[PDB]
Recover the amino acids of this structure.
């Protein structure tokens, strides 16, 4: 499982609920949550590409009408190691 | 609502004109209980077990919303055995 | 409001037509208390502990503002143990 | 009792709701539920006439706005034996 | 009694009530009830022609405003044996 | 059975047919028929309240479009003895 | 109005939809008195001595004039010592 | 766990997906799925009232825009035994 | 694999065409076909998530204009065991 | 003969007549007829591709104005085995 | 209990008011308050499902008109462990 | 003194001046000042209810036309201990 999925919302209630939806929907692993600042919360997951696709689709559709909504949802098939040295290995 | 049995009728010749022509009945819960007076909205005879409503709802149940009532008889219980 | 438990159902065939089709239920606070009659606004079975409202609010809680009621059952207590 | 009451609804959620309301309103006994076909469900109860009248009224109003609604309610006080030989005796 | 009468309605409450009306109104014998499918219920009775006429008239007039109404009501004076081998002898 | 039911029609054909409808529909006992005069015929039945309700409903709906119609149909739950001494004990 | 002290909270999951989201509270006059249920219109914790209104006025005091209530808590007594 | 929750939809894809949503959202136990006929599928769950409320809310909101939608979603706090003898004990 | 995919069509010609297209597109295994009632047919396949996503997409577009069309397509990556006990294990 | 042809109609008269037309027009083998439900009847034939094309053309043109018409007619050149284990080997 | 409830407000006066109302309404335990950034404050409580539903409803309405208001309220009955490892365990 | 008063403004000049007004007007004790983030500053005081009412009224009226104004001012008569474990005991 070395594929990446990110969802970014404004507020923390949509972020918790999107992470919950992701983890129940697919077999992906939660590796990080953080506050970008100014009201932005970002959640990241790791898994196979087929699992990450499903997890991000479910999570993006399960946070639209909660709170102020979501800002972004992105899927990356394979990452570079230089980038990998700035991602959290555990929350 | 409460379950009471009737005892007899009651007649008073001088009454508020707003009370119309409806009859009045004397009721207790049980022999020896403090007697009360109800407005007979259906028609019942001594010894019957009846259902009595007392509220602001009694006025609407006996006539119009401006009736001067605070206890009305609604139905007769088909079998009570109390 | 008050906490009451039900005992059985009650049927009276001749009723005010305003009372609609709603059921009626016999309730006490506790075995041996003076039984009363309530309008079942949700649906409950013997032995349940329920919450009963009796006022001018019972009419609005059971139907419309013109319903002839003075005691209505609102909810069922999730756990009471009383 | 030897009196019959029936409510027929379109769907099963209103039928279950009506059956529960019947059994809770009065002192009646539930002997039959059946799928007529094409989305119809019929519920039948047996008992005394005064009990069954109240049971059918309460059942008819507990399922009026649930689901797709109800189709028909009906009461029979005296049943012919020829008709009795096409009725269920247990649920 | 070798004359036939049939009523077809949609739903089962009108069918029970129509069968009850037939059996009370005339001296006819109830031989079958069935579900055609799609919501159709059919009731058949056997008797003399004069009894079957009265039974079908009463039954047809006793199910018009119950439920969704009735679809058909028919009387046959005498039937063929080839057709008789597809009719129910008892319900 | 000490509850009373009355139907009053104009003509005697609707009265016979209403009495027949009552006796078939519910378990009530026919105690009297009489001519008030001027074309009025009255039919009375005795039974339990639950039986009398059903009988009067059926009888009232079974004389509306026969002849000149009906005038009244009324149900009394319990009667006084003073009034009981003007009712027919048998027809 | 009457002076009562609270004991605990009460939860019932199936309620009339008209009651909104307001909490419910169990109150007695004094330990051993018949417990009642009130609508918490301010917010109070066990052991407090509070003022309770029960009438047609309780509905207007807890929400709108169509609220199904017959006992509401208005204030908390600054010092009672009773 | 003696509280009931029912959802009824048209089609079987929404029924499977609603049952999945229920079981993931709350701690409820699946006891039955059936075809009423004519395209109606019904799913039933048992649990505590607090669990059944959450399960039915999630399930009803997770079948709205899949297929032909849902028809009904209903919650019963406590049921009668007469009705209990017509419910499935296992799928 | 333990991932699930469903297509529901109205008719059986589009359902057979969709099942064939599923099995030809990816590496999935066919476990169930069923008539819901009223003209609905549902087809289910099992496999890995990446295979099932592609299989359901290809099947959804191979039967869109055959017959009366399709009603619903859906993919589930992780299935609860309570839901698993209502699923077919062989066709 | 391992190519497949299907016609689906509404009603059984057009289905019998279409199957008859197929078998007379081409050298194809009848392997199945079934009722999907709701009024749908499906007929399947097996043969070489050149025979199946002719059979399906004749059958589709020989059931258009009989009854309520046809719903679909489809030809498959080669089928998968996972799909083959849900087709009837004989009627 | 293992059920979760969250209210998120903009400001801290509404957040304190909502937390107090939560703890007063039902039998829940307060485990976390946090500043998301840019004016957001989130309050989380744990308990049983029936208690938490009532607590979140009362909290959502006690802070609706205090300050700048609330942003979101939400309830979760069953929490995944992957999500539990990003939640506070004490205030 | 176990009653709580809160004032929340945007900027720190109105917060200092409101705290000064509170402490001068009534006998209340300053227990905390904090930055919620995004420009929000909150001041809390403890005292008897009669003192806290006066302090909050004076403080709210003494910061309206300084800076960008105030956001909220709220008075709580009695607090829960679960909430008390998130309030500052000293600044």
């Amino acid at each position: 499982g070395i594929a990446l999925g990110m969802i970014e919302t404004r507020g923390l209630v949509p972020a918790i609920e999107a992470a919950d939806a992701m983890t129940k929907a697919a077999e992906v692993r939660l590796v990080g949550r953080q506050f970008v600042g100014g009201g932005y919360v970002t959640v990241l997951v790791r898994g196979e590409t087929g699992a990450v696709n499903a997890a991000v689709r479910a999570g993006a559709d399960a946070c639209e009408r909660v709170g102020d909504g979501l800002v972004a949802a992105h899927i990356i098939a394979r990452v570079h190691s230089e980038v990998e040295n700035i991602l959290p290995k555990a929350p | 609502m409460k379950i009471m049995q009737v005892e007899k009728t009651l007649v008073s010749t001088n009454r508020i004109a707003d009370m119309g022509h409806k009859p009045l009945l004397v009721v207790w819960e049980k022999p020896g209980a403090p007697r009360q007076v109800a407005v007979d909205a259906i028609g019942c005879i001594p010894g019957d077990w009846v259902l009595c409503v007392g509220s602001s709802a009694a006025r609407e149940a006996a006539g119009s919303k401006s009736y001067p009532s605070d206890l009305t008889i609604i139905g007769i219980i088909d079998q009570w055995n109390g």
About this structure: Residues 13-25 of chain A form the longest helix (13 residues). The beta strands of chain A are 3-10, 29-35, 40-47, 70-76.
